[PDB]
mmCIF file of C-alpha atoms and ligand atoms in Angstrom:
data_model
loop_
_atom_site.group_PDB
_atom_site.id
_atom_site.type_symbol
_atom_site.label_atom_id
_atom_site.label_comp_id
_atom_site.label_asym_id
_atom_site.label_seq_id
_atom_site.Cartn_x
_atom_site.Cartn_y
_atom_site.Cartn_z
ATOM 1 C CA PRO A 1 -1.881 -24.084 8.445
ATOM 2 C CA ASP A 2 -3.935 -20.969 7.666
ATOM 3 C CA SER A 3 -0.882 -18.747 8.248
ATOM 4 C CA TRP A 4 -0.633 -18.321 4.456
ATOM 5 C CA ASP A 5 -2.991 -18.605 1.489
ATOM 6 C CA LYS A 6 -3.390 -22.040 -0.090
ATOM 7 C CA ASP A 7 -4.364 -20.631 -3.498
ATOM 8 C CA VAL A 8 -1.016 -18.892 -4.052
ATOM 9 C CA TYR A 9 1.021 -21.820 -2.632
ATOM 10 C CA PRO A 10 -0.965 -24.881 -3.724
ATOM 11 C CA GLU A 11 -0.108 -28.406 -2.619
ATOM 12 C CA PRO A 12 -1.363 -31.831 -3.748
ATOM 13 C CA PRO A 13 -3.953 -33.560 -1.519
ATOM 14 C CA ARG A 14 -1.066 -35.302 0.317
ATOM 15 C CA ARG A 15 -1.984 -38.966 -0.017
ATOM 16 C CA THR A 16 -0.130 -41.355 2.299
ATOM 17 C CA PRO A 17 -0.422 -45.149 2.609
ATOM 18 C CA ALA A 18 -1.452 -47.147 5.682
ATOM 19 C CA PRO A 19 0.948 -49.427 7.599
ATOM 20 C CA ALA A 20 0.454 -53.043 6.485
ATOM 21 C CA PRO A 21 3.239 -55.072 8.117
ATOM 22 C CA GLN A 22 3.867 -58.613 6.889
ATOM 23 C CA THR A 23 5.908 -59.555 9.984
ATOM 24 C CA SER A 24 5.223 -59.643 13.718
ATOM 25 C CA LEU A 25 8.687 -58.329 14.599
ATOM 26 C CA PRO A 26 8.336 -55.061 16.564
ATOM 27 C CA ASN A 27 8.976 -51.921 14.537
ATOM 28 C CA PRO A 28 11.771 -49.774 16.035
ATOM 29 C CA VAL A 29 10.506 -46.749 14.095
ATOM 30 C CA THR A 30 7.127 -46.669 15.862
ATOM 31 C CA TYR A 31 8.632 -47.142 19.333
ATOM 32 C CA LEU A 32 11.218 -44.426 18.660
ATOM 33 C CA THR A 33 8.451 -42.133 17.399
ATOM 34 C CA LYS A 34 6.444 -42.730 20.579
ATOM 35 C CA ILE A 35 9.490 -42.004 22.746
ATOM 36 C CA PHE A 36 10.259 -38.872 20.723
ATOM 37 C CA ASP A 37 6.740 -37.464 20.862
ATOM 38 C CA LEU A 38 6.287 -38.178 24.579
ATOM 39 C CA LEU A 39 9.698 -36.782 25.551
ATOM 40 C CA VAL A 40 9.867 -33.784 23.180
ATOM 41 C CA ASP A 41 6.600 -32.798 21.527
ATOM 42 C CA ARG A 42 4.440 -32.656 24.662
ATOM 43 C CA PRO A 43 6.703 -30.201 26.567
ATOM 44 C CA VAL A 44 7.068 -28.187 23.355
ATOM 45 C CA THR A 45 3.287 -28.033 22.926
ATOM 46 C CA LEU A 46 2.830 -27.038 26.574
ATOM 47 C CA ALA A 47 5.384 -24.229 26.295
ATOM 48 C CA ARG A 48 3.913 -23.024 22.999
ATOM 49 C CA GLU A 49 0.372 -23.000 24.383
ATOM 50 C CA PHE A 50 1.588 -21.036 27.418
ATOM 51 C CA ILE A 51 3.246 -18.494 25.117
ATOM 52 C CA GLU A 52 0.111 -18.327 22.950
ATOM 53 C CA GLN A 53 -2.182 -17.674 25.912
ATOM 54 C CA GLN A 54 0.273 -15.029 27.130
ATOM 55 C CA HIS A 55 0.070 -13.390 23.696
ATOM 56 C CA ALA A 56 -3.737 -13.566 23.729
ATOM 57 C CA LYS A 57 -3.781 -11.303 26.808
ATOM 58 C CA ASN A 58 -2.253 -8.392 24.846
ATOM 59 C CA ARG A 59 -3.309 -8.317 21.194
ATOM 60 C CA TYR A 60 -2.640 -5.543 18.679
ATOM 61 C CA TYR A 61 -2.769 -5.302 14.896
ATOM 62 C CA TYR A 62 -0.540 -4.071 12.084
ATOM 63 C CA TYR A 63 -1.920 -3.130 8.678
ATOM 64 C CA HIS A 64 -0.750 -3.540 5.093
ATOM 65 C CA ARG A 65 0.072 -0.150 3.592
ATOM 66 C CA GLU A 66 -2.033 0.823 0.578
ATOM 67 C CA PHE A 67 -0.711 2.940 -2.290
ATOM 68 C CA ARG A 68 -2.662 4.852 -4.917
ATOM 69 C CA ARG A 69 -2.242 4.633 -8.701
ATOM 70 C CA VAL A 70 -0.528 7.885 -9.722
ATOM 71 C CA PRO A 71 0.038 8.698 -13.424
ATOM 72 C CA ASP A 72 2.836 6.723 -15.050
ATOM 73 C CA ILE A 73 5.830 7.942 -17.057
ATOM 74 C CA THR A 74 3.789 7.966 -20.284
ATOM 75 C CA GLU A 75 1.515 10.738 -18.942
ATOM 76 C CA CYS A 76 4.332 13.116 -17.938
ATOM 77 C CA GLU A 77 5.673 16.093 -19.859
ATOM 78 C CA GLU A 78 9.279 16.159 -21.031
ATOM 79 C CA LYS A 79 10.678 18.249 -18.155
ATOM 80 C CA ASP A 80 7.964 18.006 -15.477
ATOM 81 C CA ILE A 81 9.987 16.856 -12.484
ATOM 82 C CA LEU A 82 7.148 16.221 -10.007
ATOM 83 C CA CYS A 83 5.174 13.860 -12.244
ATOM 84 C CA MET A 84 8.463 12.255 -13.273
ATOM 85 C CA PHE A 85 9.304 11.598 -9.614
ATOM 86 C CA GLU A 86 5.846 10.156 -8.932
ATOM 87 C CA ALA A 87 6.017 7.879 -11.977
ATOM 88 C CA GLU A 88 9.560 6.749 -11.153
ATOM 89 C CA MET A 89 8.612 5.785 -7.596
ATOM 90 C CA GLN A 90 5.529 3.923 -8.830
ATOM 91 C CA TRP A 91 7.602 2.095 -11.455
ATOM 92 C CA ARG A 92 10.185 1.056 -8.856
ATOM 93 C CA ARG A 93 7.450 -0.293 -6.577
ATOM 94 C CA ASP A 94 5.980 -2.242 -9.505
ATOM 95 C CA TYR A 95 9.464 -3.597 -10.262
ATOM 96 C CA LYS A 96 9.754 -4.857 -6.680
ATOM 97 C CA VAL A 97 6.304 -6.470 -6.910
ATOM 98 C CA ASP A 98 7.266 -8.217 -10.160
ATOM 99 C CA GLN A 99 10.472 -9.476 -8.541
ATOM 100 C CA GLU A 100 8.434 -10.966 -5.698
ATOM 101 C CA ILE A 101 6.036 -12.565 -8.206
ATOM 102 C CA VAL A 102 8.993 -14.256 -9.903
ATOM 103 C CA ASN A 103 10.180 -15.347 -6.453
ATOM 104 C CA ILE A 104 6.780 -16.911 -5.717
ATOM 105 C CA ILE A 105 6.778 -18.838 -8.997
ATOM 106 C CA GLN A 106 10.339 -20.044 -8.348
ATOM 107 C CA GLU A 107 9.322 -21.262 -4.887
ATOM 108 C CA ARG A 108 6.410 -23.143 -6.463
ATOM 109 C CA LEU A 109 8.775 -24.805 -8.938
ATOM 110 C CA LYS A 110 11.254 -25.797 -6.218
ATOM 111 C CA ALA A 111 8.501 -27.289 -4.056
ATOM 112 C CA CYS A 112 7.161 -29.236 -7.041
ATOM 113 C CA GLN A 113 10.604 -30.651 -7.819
ATOM 114 C CA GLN A 114 11.243 -31.740 -4.237
ATOM 115 C CA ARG A 115 7.772 -33.203 -3.689
ATOM 116 C CA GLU A 116 7.356 -35.203 -6.902
ATOM 117 C CA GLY A 117 10.469 -37.340 -6.368
ATOM 118 C CA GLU A 118 11.599 -39.361 -9.384
ATOM 119 C CA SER A 119 8.634 -38.206 -11.511
ATOM 120 C CA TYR A 120 9.504 -34.497 -11.274
ATOM 121 C CA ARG A 121 10.298 -34.369 -14.996
ATOM 122 C CA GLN A 122 6.709 -35.281 -15.892
ATOM 123 C CA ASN A 123 4.736 -34.166 -12.828
ATOM 124 C CA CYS A 124 6.152 -30.603 -12.810
ATOM 125 C CA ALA A 125 5.263 -29.525 -16.349
ATOM 126 C CA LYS A 126 2.698 -26.919 -15.274
ATOM 127 C CA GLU A 127 5.106 -25.269 -12.841
ATOM 128 C CA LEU A 128 7.872 -25.308 -15.455
ATOM 129 C CA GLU A 129 5.684 -23.637 -18.077
ATOM 130 C CA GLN A 130 4.394 -21.090 -15.549
ATOM 131 C CA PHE A 131 7.977 -20.188 -14.666
ATOM 132 C CA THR A 132 8.859 -20.029 -18.364
ATOM 133 C CA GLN A 133 6.043 -17.555 -19.036
ATOM 134 C CA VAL A 134 6.805 -15.415 -15.977
ATOM 135 C CA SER A 135 10.544 -15.337 -16.711
ATOM 136 C CA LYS A 136 9.890 -14.451 -20.358
ATOM 137 C CA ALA A 137 7.679 -11.534 -19.317
ATOM 138 C CA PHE A 138 10.204 -10.365 -16.711
ATOM 139 C CA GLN A 139 13.023 -10.541 -19.269
ATOM 140 C CA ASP A 140 10.955 -8.584 -21.792
ATOM 141 C CA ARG A 141 10.240 -5.923 -19.172
ATOM 142 C CA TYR A 142 13.457 -5.372 -17.229
ATOM 143 C CA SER A 143 16.381 -7.220 -18.834
ATOM 144 C CA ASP A 144 19.389 -5.274 -20.189
ATOM 145 C CA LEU A 145 18.385 -2.046 -18.424
ATOM 146 C CA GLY A 146 21.590 -2.273 -16.384
ATOM 147 C CA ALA A 147 22.521 -0.117 -13.444
ATOM 148 C CA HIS A 148 21.006 3.372 -13.314
ATOM 149 C CA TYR A 149 17.786 1.912 -14.691
ATOM 150 C CA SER A 150 14.696 4.103 -14.796
ATOM 151 C CA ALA A 151 11.127 4.196 -16.050
ATOM 152 C CA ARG A 152 12.282 6.144 -19.112
ATOM 153 C CA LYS A 153 14.737 3.418 -20.151
ATOM 154 C CA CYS A 154 12.087 0.720 -19.702
ATOM 155 C CA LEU A 155 9.670 2.815 -21.769
ATOM 156 C CA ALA A 156 12.277 3.228 -24.517
ATOM 157 C CA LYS A 157 12.943 -0.521 -24.567
ATOM 158 C CA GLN A 158 9.207 -1.225 -24.773
ATOM 159 C CA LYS A 159 8.796 1.319 -27.582
ATOM 160 C CA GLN A 160 11.646 -0.248 -29.561
ATOM 161 C CA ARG A 161 10.152 -3.716 -29.090
ATOM 162 C CA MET A 162 6.730 -2.454 -30.186
ATOM 163 C CA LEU A 163 8.235 -0.815 -33.276
ATOM 164 C CA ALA A 164 9.991 -4.058 -34.218
ATOM 165 C CA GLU A 165 6.801 -6.063 -33.646
ATOM 166 C CA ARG A 166 4.736 -3.654 -35.749
ATOM 167 C CA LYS A 167 7.278 -3.749 -38.581
ATOM 168 C CA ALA A 168 7.306 -7.558 -38.534
ATOM 169 C CA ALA A 169 3.497 -7.695 -38.440
ATOM 170 C CA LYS A 170 3.108 -5.328 -41.395
ATOM 171 C CA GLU A 171 5.776 -7.211 -43.359
ATOM 172 C CA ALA A 172 3.905 -10.465 -42.716
ATOM 173 C CA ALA A 173 0.601 -8.831 -43.704
ATOM 174 C CA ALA A 174 2.298 -7.617 -46.913
ATOM 175 C CA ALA A 175 2.366 -11.237 -48.138
ATOM 176 C CA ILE B 1 12.308 2.111 16.940
ATOM 177 C CA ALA B 2 10.220 3.572 14.111
ATOM 178 C CA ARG B 3 8.120 5.670 16.494
ATOM 179 C CA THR B 4 11.048 6.918 18.593
ATOM 180 C CA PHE B 5 13.675 7.614 15.925
ATOM 181 C CA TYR B 6 12.036 7.882 12.484
ATOM 182 C CA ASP B 7 9.053 9.424 10.695
ATOM 183 C CA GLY B 8 6.652 8.335 7.983
ATOM 184 C CA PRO B 9 7.513 8.036 4.306
ATOM 185 C CA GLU B 10 5.215 10.934 3.356
ATOM 186 C CA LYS B 11 7.548 13.481 4.961
ATOM 187 C CA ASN B 12 10.583 12.324 2.972
ATOM 188 C CA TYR B 13 8.458 11.968 -0.175
ATOM 189 C CA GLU B 14 7.154 15.538 -0.079
ATOM 190 C CA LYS B 15 10.507 16.979 1.008
ATOM 191 C CA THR B 16 12.049 15.253 -2.015
ATOM 192 C CA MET B 17 9.409 16.795 -4.270
ATOM 193 C CA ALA B 18 10.074 20.266 -2.844
ATOM 194 C CA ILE B 19 13.838 19.854 -3.280
ATOM 195 C CA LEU B 20 13.370 18.612 -6.850
ATOM 196 C CA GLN B 21 11.168 21.594 -7.701
ATOM 197 C CA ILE B 22 13.714 24.035 -6.258
ATOM 198 C CA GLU B 23 16.612 22.439 -8.142
ATOM 199 C CA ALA B 24 14.726 22.280 -11.453
ATOM 200 C CA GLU B 25 13.731 25.938 -11.109
ATOM 201 C CA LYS B 26 17.361 26.840 -10.386
ATOM 202 C CA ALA B 27 18.567 24.916 -13.446
ATOM 203 C CA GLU B 28 16.049 26.580 -15.760
ATOM 204 C CA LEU B 29 16.945 29.975 -14.278
ATOM 205 C CA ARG B 30 20.656 29.376 -14.892
ATOM 206 C CA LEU B 31 20.050 28.406 -18.520
ATOM 207 C CA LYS B 32 17.769 31.418 -19.046
ATOM 208 C CA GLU B 33 20.359 33.737 -17.482
ATOM 209 C CA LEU B 34 23.072 32.382 -19.776
ATOM 210 C CA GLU B 35 20.880 32.938 -22.840
ATOM 211 C CA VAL B 36 19.960 36.461 -21.697
ATOM 212 C CA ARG B 37 23.621 37.318 -21.104
ATOM 213 C CA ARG B 38 24.545 36.068 -24.572
ATOM 214 C CA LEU B 39 21.778 38.115 -26.203
ATOM 215 C CA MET B 40 22.619 41.284 -24.256
ATOM 216 C CA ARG B 41 26.318 41.010 -25.099
ATOM 217 C CA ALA B 42 25.533 40.363 -28.771
ATOM 218 C CA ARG B 43 23.045 43.226 -29.201
ATOM 219 C CA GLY B 44 23.705 45.741 -26.427
ATOM 220 C CA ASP B 45 20.042 46.775 -26.189
ATOM 221 C CA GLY B 46 19.621 45.626 -22.583
ATOM 222 C CA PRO B 47 20.687 47.085 -19.241
ATOM 223 C CA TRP B 48 23.788 44.884 -19.169
ATOM 224 C CA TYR B 49 26.999 45.489 -21.136
ATOM 225 C CA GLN B 50 26.237 49.204 -21.541
ATOM 226 C CA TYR B 51 29.669 50.612 -22.298
ATOM 227 C CA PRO B 52 30.002 54.370 -21.733
ATOM 228 C CA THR B 53 29.567 56.940 -24.485
ATOM 229 C CA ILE B 54 30.484 60.618 -24.533
ATOM 230 C CA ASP B 55 28.036 62.787 -22.604
ATOM 231 C CA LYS B 56 26.272 65.264 -24.883
ATOM 232 C CA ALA B 57 26.012 67.800 -22.041
ATOM 233 C CA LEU B 58 29.665 68.714 -22.682
ATOM 234 C CA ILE B 59 28.829 70.177 -26.107
ATOM 235 C CA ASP B 60 28.889 73.981 -26.238
ATOM 236 C CA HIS B 61 25.913 75.293 -28.241
ATOM 237 C CA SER B 62 27.070 78.886 -28.663
ATOM 238 C CA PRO B 63 28.180 81.054 -31.593
ATOM 239 C CA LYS B 64 31.721 80.014 -32.481
ATOM 240 C CA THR B 65 33.252 83.218 -33.948
ATOM 241 C CA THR B 66 32.546 81.621 -37.336
ATOM 242 C CA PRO B 67 29.045 80.987 -38.738
ATOM 243 C CA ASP B 68 29.936 77.506 -40.034
ATOM 244 C CA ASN B 69 31.029 76.339 -36.548
HETATM 245 C C1 PLX C 1 12.058 -2.471 24.246
HETATM 246 C C2 PLX C 1 13.485 -2.383 23.622
HETATM 247 C C3 PLX C 1 14.235 -3.755 23.652
HETATM 248 C C4 PLX C 1 15.471 -3.777 22.695
HETATM 249 C C5 PLX C 1 16.426 -2.556 22.922
HETATM 250 C C6 PLX C 1 17.168 -2.109 21.605
HETATM 251 C C7 PLX C 1 18.313 -1.063 21.902
HETATM 252 C C8 PLX C 1 18.324 0.131 20.887
HETATM 253 C C9 PLX C 1 18.979 1.424 21.508
HETATM 254 C C10 PLX C 1 20.265 1.883 20.742
HETATM 255 C C11 PLX C 1 20.044 3.224 19.953
HETATM 256 C C12 PLX C 1 21.008 3.357 18.724
HETATM 257 C C13 PLX C 1 21.448 4.839 18.475
HETATM 258 C C14 PLX C 1 20.611 5.527 17.348
HETATM 259 C C15 PLX C 1 20.069 6.937 17.788
HETATM 260 C C16 PLX C 1 19.370 7.711 16.608
HETATM 261 C C17 PLX C 1 19.685 9.256 16.631
HETATM 262 C C18 PLX C 1 18.636 10.083 15.841
HETATM 263 O O1 PLX C 1 18.473 9.535 14.588
HETATM 264 O O2 PLX C 1 17.396 10.061 16.528
HETATM 265 C C19 PLX C 1 16.970 11.314 16.990
HETATM 266 C C20 PLX C 1 15.904 11.118 18.087
HETATM 267 O O3 PLX C 1 16.459 11.532 19.337
HETATM 268 C C21 PLX C 1 16.578 10.488 20.277
HETATM 269 O O4 PLX C 1 16.237 10.959 21.538
HETATM 270 C C22 PLX C 1 18.031 9.967 20.294
HETATM 271 C C23 PLX C 1 18.518 9.603 21.732
HETATM 272 C C24 PLX C 1 19.586 8.466 21.727
HETATM 273 C C25 PLX C 1 20.961 8.937 22.312
HETATM 274 C C26 PLX C 1 22.052 7.818 22.243
HETATM 275 C C27 PLX C 1 23.091 7.934 23.423
HETATM 276 C C28 PLX C 1 23.439 6.539 24.072
HETATM 277 C C29 PLX C 1 24.843 6.562 24.795
HETATM 278 C C30 PLX C 1 24.798 5.926 26.246
HETATM 279 C C31 PLX C 1 26.245 5.701 26.837
HETATM 280 C C32 PLX C 1 26.238 5.501 28.411
HETATM 281 C C33 PLX C 1 26.384 6.861 29.185
HETATM 282 C C34 PLX C 1 27.077 6.684 30.585
HETATM 283 C C35 PLX C 1 28.621 6.912 30.514
HETATM 284 C C36 PLX C 1 29.365 6.296 31.726
HETATM 285 C C37 PLX C 1 16.345 12.110 15.835
HETATM 286 O O5 PLX C 1 16.044 13.422 16.318
HETATM 287 P P1 PLX C 1 14.529 14.062 16.015
HETATM 288 O O6 PLX C 1 14.515 14.763 14.672
HETATM 289 O O7 PLX C 1 14.179 15.060 17.102
HETATM 290 O O8 PLX C 1 13.397 12.832 16.015
HETATM 291 C C38 PLX C 1 12.767 12.481 14.781
HETATM 292 C C39 PLX C 1 11.758 11.306 15.041
HETATM 293 N N1 PLX C 1 10.587 11.717 15.890
HETATM 294 C C40 PLX C 1 10.155 13.059 15.451
HETATM 295 C C41 PLX C 1 9.508 10.718 15.627
HETATM 296 C C42 PLX C 1 10.744 11.779 17.366
#
């Protein structure tokens, strides 16, 4: 339902075929489904609607907490501890957000594999490449930092990668 | 539970900043004190490490029964 956003967790249009029986023998599946729905789903719906109308009598809200964009570790002096603390907290929050992004992409890939059945190898190419890109970016950002990671270590890794990339680019341009 | 037993994150955040500032100031003060102690012991021009010298008020500035002292 509308409990979540369909754009971040997309699903195919969910096409299903119509029953076209070739035999007049009664279908046990349909009779069992009727018995199940009558004997289970109706009391469950009644109880749930009672609970929902009880909830509607007392309604309150909770809000998503918003954070500002404080200066990052690149805009902090060498021994300025306050700006360092601010940047470190912001970097850790961004790290958590990136972890959840990777989680979302992984959930998309798992759902694609389960849904597509025997065609998952061909019908889940877009999800596979999305996960490949996201995992590559995550590995470039945070891999090999180890325990006691910090914004400074990530910055040093990024600087080393940028130096290597610039050296390779200038060597290629020297041809 | 949060209302009865805990506070907001801003309190802990700003207390952490205050503690960090105090500790960083203490560290810089300790390093500065060590450097100052080293300099004063090396040179002796500061208030510290002032070893005693003979008081000049003990000198007798009077004729000494001999003109050449
Ligand atoms: C509607 C609820 C349904 C579910 C019920 C859940 C049950 C949860 C109850 C279990 C409580 C677990 C114990 C944890 C206590 C936390 C102690 C401390 O952290 O809290 C203090 C808060 O004080 C509380 O009053 C603590 C009182 C709890 C005392 C526990 C004793 C229970 C023992 C009972 C044994 C039976 C006795 C009879 C013997 C025969 C903090 O002091 P303070 O810095 O000021 O407040 C800061 C936060 N403020 C400013 C927002 C208010």
